[PDB]
């Protein structure tokens, strides 16, 4: 299956309506919300429990973390990507019991986006003064500070037989933003067939990507087409759009918006647990 740029790529709200009108792509019965399960739910035999969080934004003190096997964090684990914030997050990870902790970057991890960092100091450096102060040596090893994680960036890991792929890019003045269309499709084309769990920082079109204040959809159209038509992971986890915290299905893939922080800037949305059968 070859994904090409959608005719509605640049206009996600119109893409949503187009596909809903013609194909009922976002309609019941197959597309619907999925209620969360409480942390005392027994894990089914032969399954692994994923604990999904995102957009913790250095506010990890006091998050009540549930029993599970593998943590998935879908980015914005810092405010600015400062090396000290990355260290604090890594320290928090090392105290969690989970066998594996898988992490991707998001928009706030400015120091992880080498193009952003190179551009910032040549332009309006005073838009991010604490970041602009950093010397090249201060952030050349930033991802290496995540010693308690497996860090993914357009890359994958097989853990307990699960194929997990992660990428930070979003279609939205922050890090890891790319123009809608081919620029993002080039990234999504890297996701392999056979991926069980896809981690991206933001949503695909139509799944937990409505922004009330803007009355628009903001998910990536190319990512949706890739997920449903080519890759078909069992789980697509993401954050970014805090208003969309919660879970949906399309009948095959489960979509989890794991945004921990709310529009009130507090990390009060509970971690979401999700069980998958072992390969
Ligand atoms: Ca260094
Ligand atoms: Ca918060």
Q: 114-123 — which CB contacts under 8 Å span 24+ positions?
A: 116/175, 116/176
Token readout for 265 is 């800037």
Q: State the residue for tokens 């792929």.
A: 165
Task: Evaluate the omega torsion of the peptide bond into residue 29 and state whether it is cis, within 30 degrees of 0.
Answer: yes
Between CA 260 and CA 44 the distance in angstroms is: 25
Q: Which fold has domain 1-279?
A: Purple Acid Phosphatase; chain A, domain 2 (3.60.21)
Q: What is the resolution of this structure in A?
A: 1.3
- Annotate 238-275 with b (16+ C-beta within 10 A) or e (fewer): bbbbbbbbbbbebeebbbbbbbbbeeeeebebbbbbbb
Q: Are the beta carbons of 161 and 278 closer than 8 angstroms?
A: yes
Token readout for 177 is 């933003």
Q: How far apart are the CA of 75 and the centre of ligand 2, in A? A: 13
**Taking Cα atoms as reference points, which of 60, 36, 50 lies closest to residue 260?**
60
Between CA 10 and CA 176 the distance in angstroms is: 18
- Identify the H or E element spanning 100: strand 100-103
Q: How far apart are the CA of 262 and the centre of ligand 2, in A? A: 6
The conformational region for residue 57 under phi > 0 = left, psi -120 to 50 = alpha, else beta, is: left
Q: State the residue for tokens 């945004």.
A: 259
Token readout for 41 is 């739910």
Between CA 216 and CA 270 the distance in angstroms is: 26
How was this structure determined? It was done by X-ray
**Taking Cα atoms as reference points, which of 223, 221, 263 lies closest to residue 9?**
221
Nearest ligand atom owner, CA of 56: 2
Q: Compute the chain's Rg from CA coordinates.
A: 18
Q: How far apart are the CA of 142 and the centre of ligand 1, in A? A: 7
Query: For residue 163, what are the β-bridge partners?
Result: 158
Q: How far apart are the CA of 105 and the centre of ligand 1, in A? A: 19
Token readout for 99 is 């066998």
Q: How far apart are the CA of 141 and the centre of ligand 1, in A? A: 5
The conformational region for residue 208 under phi > 0 = left, psi -120 to 50 = alpha, else beta, is: left
Between CA 10 and CA 7 the distance in angstroms is: 8
DSSP 35: -
**Taking Cα atoms as reference points, which of 25, 1, 75 lies closest to residue 226?**
1
Nearest ligand atom owner, CA of 261: 2
Between CA 260 and CA 55 the distance in angstroms is: 6
Q: How far apart are the CA of 131 and the centre of ligand 2, in A? A: 20
Between CA 269 and CA 55 the distance in angstroms is: 10
**Strand-strand pairing, 47-53 and 70-73:** parallel
């Amino acid at each position: 299956v070859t994904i090409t740029v959608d005719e509605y790529s640049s206009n996600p709200t119109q893409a949503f309506t187009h596909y809903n009108i013609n194909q009922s792509r976002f309609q019941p019965p197959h597309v619907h919300m999925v209620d969360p399960i409480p942390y005392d739910t027994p894990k089914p035999a032969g399954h692994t429990r994923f604990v999904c969080i995102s957009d913790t934004r250095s506010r990890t003190d006091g998050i009540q973390m549930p029993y599970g096997d593998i943590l998935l964090h879908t980015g914005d684990f810092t405010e600015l990507g400062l090396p000290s914030e990355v260290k604090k997050f890594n320290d928090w990870l090392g105290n969690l019991p989970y066998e594996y902790k898988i992490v991707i970057a998001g928009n706030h991890e400015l120091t992880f986006d080498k193009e952003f960092m190179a551009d910032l100091v040549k332009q309006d450096y005073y838009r991010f003064p604490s970041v602009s102060k950093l010397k090249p040596e201060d952030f050349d090893n930033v991802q290496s500070l995540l010693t308690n994680s497996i860090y993914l960036q357009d890359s994958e890991v097989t853990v307990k037989g699960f194929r997990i792929y992660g990428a930070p890019w979003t279609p939205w003045g922050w890090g890891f933003n790319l123009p809608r269309g081919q620029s993002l499709l080039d990234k999504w084309n890297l996701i392999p067939e056979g991926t069980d769990i896809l981690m991206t920082h933001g949503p695909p079109l139509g799944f937990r990507d409505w922004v009330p204040k803007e009355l628009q959809r903001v998910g990536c159209v190319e990512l949706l087409n890739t997920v449903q038509r080519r890759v078909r992971p069992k789980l697509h986890v993401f954050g970014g759009i805090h208003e969309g915290y919660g879970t949906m299905t399309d009948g095959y893939t489960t979509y989890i918006n794991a945004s921990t922080c709310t529009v009130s800037f507090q990390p009060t949305n509970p971690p979401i647990i999700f069980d998958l059968p072992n390969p």
